[PDB]
Amino acid sequence: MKAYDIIVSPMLTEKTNTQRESINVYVFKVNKRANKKEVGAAIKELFNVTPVSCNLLNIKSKAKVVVSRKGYPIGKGKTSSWKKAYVYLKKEDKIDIF
């Protein structure tokens, strides 16, 4: 898996924004098959900077209840689960694309 199938997209959220402003942390949606090592390697190849460390989380799928055309519960649907990555850079390092 090339370093392009690893990183999916960043996250722009209030929590991630404050974290990035304060302690220089970048949060990405990554592929569920990645791990710490190739996430770090992918960050290096993509943005030409080596991260100090990486943390990964598995976000479970959010369940929804599906109702009929009239509308009344007939089953349980679910969103897609995904993997979230916190990436820690050196205090001088930056990522510009954001």
Binding site: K2, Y4, V8, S9, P10, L12, F98
Partner: protein, 65 residues
């Protein structure tokens, strides 16, 4: 559907790399919030798949240069 139906193997490889650049940057801009042509994602993805088959055909020898 773009036209690569005359490209050589390594030219196709270079095309694949810069199209992967384009797809990654497009995803990033979409998340940042405003991209005028969301379907560009689908178009680029299909292009990359085309390149993957065509290259594969080169190694498999089905399509000869």
């Amino acid at each position: 559907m773009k036209n690569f139906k005359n490209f050589t193997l390594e030219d196709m490889k270079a095309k694949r790399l810069e199209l992967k650049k384009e797809y990654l940057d497009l995803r990033f801009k979409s998340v940042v919030g405003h991209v005028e042509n969301p379907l560009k994602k689908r178009e680029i993805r299909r292009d990359i798949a085309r390149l993957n088959t065509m290259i594969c055909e080169y190694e498999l020898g089905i399509r000869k240069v």
